PDB file of C-alpha atoms in Angstrom:
ATOM      1  CA  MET A   1    -147.516 -92.550-160.390  1.00  0.00           C
ATOM      2  CA  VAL A   2    -143.743 -92.953-160.870  1.00  0.00           C
ATOM      3  CA  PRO A   3    -141.022 -91.425-159.447  1.00  0.00           C
ATOM      4  CA  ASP A   4    -140.625 -87.459-159.456  1.00  0.00           C
ATOM      5  CA  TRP A   5    -136.908 -87.928-160.884  1.00  0.00           C
ATOM      6  CA  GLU A   6    -136.078 -84.356-160.058  1.00  0.00           C
ATOM      7  CA  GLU A   7    -136.549 -85.174-156.236  1.00  0.00           C
ATOM      8  CA  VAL A   8    -134.536 -88.685-156.440  1.00  0.00           C
ATOM      9  CA  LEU A   9    -131.392 -86.878-158.584  1.00  0.00           C
ATOM     10  CA  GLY A  10    -131.778 -84.452-155.758  1.00  0.00           C
ATOM     11  CA  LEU A  11    -130.887 -87.159-153.187  1.00  0.00           C
ATOM     12  CA  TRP A  12    -128.144 -88.613-155.595  1.00  0.00           C
ATOM     13  CA  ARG A  13    -126.537 -85.122-155.666  1.00  0.00           C
ATOM     14  CA  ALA A  14    -126.704 -84.687-151.915  1.00  0.00           C
ATOM     15  CA  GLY A  15    -125.081 -88.665-151.522  1.00  0.00           C
ATOM     16  CA  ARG A  16    -128.296 -89.864-149.987  1.00  0.00           C
ATOM     17  CA  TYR A  17    -127.663 -93.097-152.067  1.00  0.00           C
ATOM     18  CA  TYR A  18    -129.477 -95.096-149.431  1.00  0.00           C
ATOM     19  CA  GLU A  19    -132.113 -92.968-149.527  1.00  0.00           C
ATOM     20  CA  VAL A  20    -132.617 -93.315-153.286  1.00  0.00           C
ATOM     21  CA  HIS A  21    -133.007 -97.201-152.801  1.00  0.00           C
ATOM     22  CA  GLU A  22    -135.504 -96.790-149.979  1.00  0.00           C
ATOM     23  CA  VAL A  23    -137.532 -94.427-152.267  1.00  0.00           C
ATOM     24  CA  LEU A  24    -137.638 -96.221-155.423  1.00  0.00           C
ATOM     25  CA  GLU A  25    -138.351 -99.480-153.554  1.00  0.00           C
ATOM     26  CA  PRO A  26    -142.363 -98.909-153.727  1.00  0.00           C
ATOM     27  CA  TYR A  27    -142.083 -98.203-157.561  1.00  0.00           C
ATOM     28  CA  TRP A  28    -140.275-101.261-158.247  1.00  0.00           C
ATOM     29  CA  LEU A  29    -142.468-103.184-156.502  1.00  0.00           C
ATOM     30  CA  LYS A  30    -145.518-102.078-158.622  1.00  0.00           C
ATOM     31  CA  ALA A  31    -143.785-102.036-161.771  1.00  0.00           C
ATOM     32  CA  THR A  32    -143.413-104.048-164.311  1.00  0.00           C
ATOM     33  CA  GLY A  33    -141.357-105.277-167.623  1.00  0.00           C
ATOM     34  CA  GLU A  34    -139.126-102.449-168.956  1.00  0.00           C
ATOM     35  CA  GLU A  35    -139.832 -99.933-166.008  1.00  0.00           C
ATOM     36  CA  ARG A  36    -139.355-102.433-163.436  1.00  0.00           C
ATOM     37  CA  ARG A  37    -135.889-103.108-165.286  1.00  0.00           C
ATOM     38  CA  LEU A  38    -135.094 -99.488-165.043  1.00  0.00           C
ATOM     39  CA  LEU A  39    -136.034 -98.951-161.482  1.00  0.00           C
ATOM     40  CA  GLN A  40    -134.276-102.267-160.137  1.00  0.00           C
ATOM     41  CA  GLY A  41    -131.045-100.791-162.264  1.00  0.00           C
ATOM     42  CA  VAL A  42    -131.262 -97.220-160.548  1.00  0.00           C
ATOM     43  CA  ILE A  43    -131.823 -98.969-157.445  1.00  0.00           C
ATOM     44  CA  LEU A  44    -128.725-101.271-157.662  1.00  0.00           C
ATOM     45  CA  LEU A  45    -126.292 -98.321-159.154  1.00  0.00           C
ATOM     46  CA  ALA A  46    -127.472 -96.581-156.020  1.00  0.00           C
ATOM     47  CA  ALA A  47    -126.682 -99.415-153.792  1.00  0.00           C
ATOM     48  CA  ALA A  48    -122.985 -99.975-155.570  1.00  0.00           C
ATOM     49  CA  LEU A  49    -122.274 -96.296-154.509  1.00  0.00           C
ATOM     50  CA  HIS A  50    -123.446 -96.696-150.962  1.00  0.00           C
ATOM     51  CA  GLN A  51    -121.565-100.306-150.649  1.00  0.00           C
ATOM     52  CA  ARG A  52    -118.319 -98.012-151.731  1.00  0.00           C
ATOM     53  CA  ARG A  53    -118.819 -95.307-149.253  1.00  0.00           C
ATOM     54  CA  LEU A  54    -118.545 -97.929-146.798  1.00  0.00           C
ATOM     55  CA  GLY A  55    -115.547 -99.329-148.187  1.00  0.00           C
ATOM     56  CA  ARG A  56    -117.160-102.371-149.378  1.00  0.00           C
ATOM     57  CA  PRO A  57    -117.257-103.725-153.215  1.00  0.00           C
ATOM     58  CA  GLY A  58    -119.414-102.124-155.467  1.00  0.00           C
ATOM     59  CA  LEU A  59    -118.952-103.784-158.884  1.00  0.00           C
ATOM     60  CA  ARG A  60    -120.910-106.733-158.317  1.00  0.00           C
ATOM     61  CA  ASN A  61    -123.984-104.139-158.089  1.00  0.00           C
ATOM     62  CA  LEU A  62    -122.844-102.172-160.827  1.00  0.00           C
ATOM     63  CA  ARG A  63    -122.566-105.411-162.860  1.00  0.00           C
ATOM     64  CA  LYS A  64    -126.138-106.391-162.104  1.00  0.00           C
ATOM     65  CA  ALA A  65    -127.594-102.676-162.879  1.00  0.00           C
ATOM     66  CA  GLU A  66    -125.843-102.963-166.110  1.00  0.00           C
ATOM     67  CA  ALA A  67    -127.591-106.496-167.002  1.00  0.00           C
ATOM     68  CA  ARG A  68    -131.127-104.926-165.890  1.00  0.00           C
ATOM     69  CA  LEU A  69    -130.378-101.783-167.897  1.00  0.00           C
ATOM     70  CA  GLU A  70    -129.213-103.483-171.086  1.00  0.00           C
ATOM     71  CA  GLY A  71    -131.146-102.820-174.078  1.00  0.00           C
ATOM     72  CA  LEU A  72    -133.405-100.500-172.705  1.00  0.00           C
ATOM     73  CA  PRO A  73    -134.739 -97.454-174.760  1.00  0.00           C
ATOM     74  CA  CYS A  74    -133.640 -94.367-172.944  1.00  0.00           C
ATOM     75  CA  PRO A  75    -135.005 -91.600-171.376  1.00  0.00           C
ATOM     76  CA  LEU A  76    -137.263 -94.175-170.122  1.00  0.00           C
ATOM     77  CA  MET A  77    -139.797 -93.062-167.242  1.00  0.00           C
ATOM     78  CA  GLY A  78    -138.629 -89.569-168.014  1.00  0.00           C
ATOM     79  CA  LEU A  79    -135.004 -90.327-166.754  1.00  0.00           C
ATOM     80  CA  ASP A  80    -131.542 -90.470-168.817  1.00  0.00           C
ATOM     81  CA  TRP A  81    -130.402 -93.546-167.272  1.00  0.00           C
ATOM     82  CA  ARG A  82    -127.501 -93.673-169.677  1.00  0.00           C
ATOM     83  CA  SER A  83    -126.154 -90.605-167.837  1.00  0.00           C
ATOM     84  CA  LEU A  84    -126.643 -91.953-164.136  1.00  0.00           C
ATOM     85  CA  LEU A  85    -124.995 -95.039-165.016  1.00  0.00           C
ATOM     86  CA  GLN A  86    -121.977 -93.226-166.600  1.00  0.00           C
ATOM     87  CA  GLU A  87    -121.716 -91.010-163.422  1.00  0.00           C
ATOM     88  CA  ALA A  88    -121.911 -94.375-161.435  1.00  0.00           C
ATOM     89  CA  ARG A  89    -119.113 -96.050-163.718  1.00  0.00           C
ATOM     90  CA  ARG A  90    -116.929 -92.980-163.077  1.00  0.00           C
ATOM     91  CA  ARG A  91    -117.493 -92.918-159.201  1.00  0.00           C
ATOM     92  CA  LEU A  92    -116.394 -96.837-158.957  1.00  0.00           C
ATOM     93  CA  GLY A  93    -113.628 -96.391-160.911  1.00  0.00           C
ATOM     94  CA  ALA A  94    -115.200 -98.982-163.877  1.00  0.00           C
TER      95      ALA A  94
END
């Protein structure tokens, strides 16, 4: 079992960033290597946007996400993460 990205991106599109974080935690906990890095990276991008919605800094989370996603193949786990990272960056003004 791996995330159904259609559902996850659905939450993201609906602005439920914290929910994306909560839904991916169980997968990250069971994951290893590249897959674990990808899951944590997506979690950190969601976390960054959630923080900014509260008027709090999101760049620290974006930086950590980039560190995890750096060097991963794309797509991975059926997700085009380069696009998601691109969107997060734009939303953060990064």
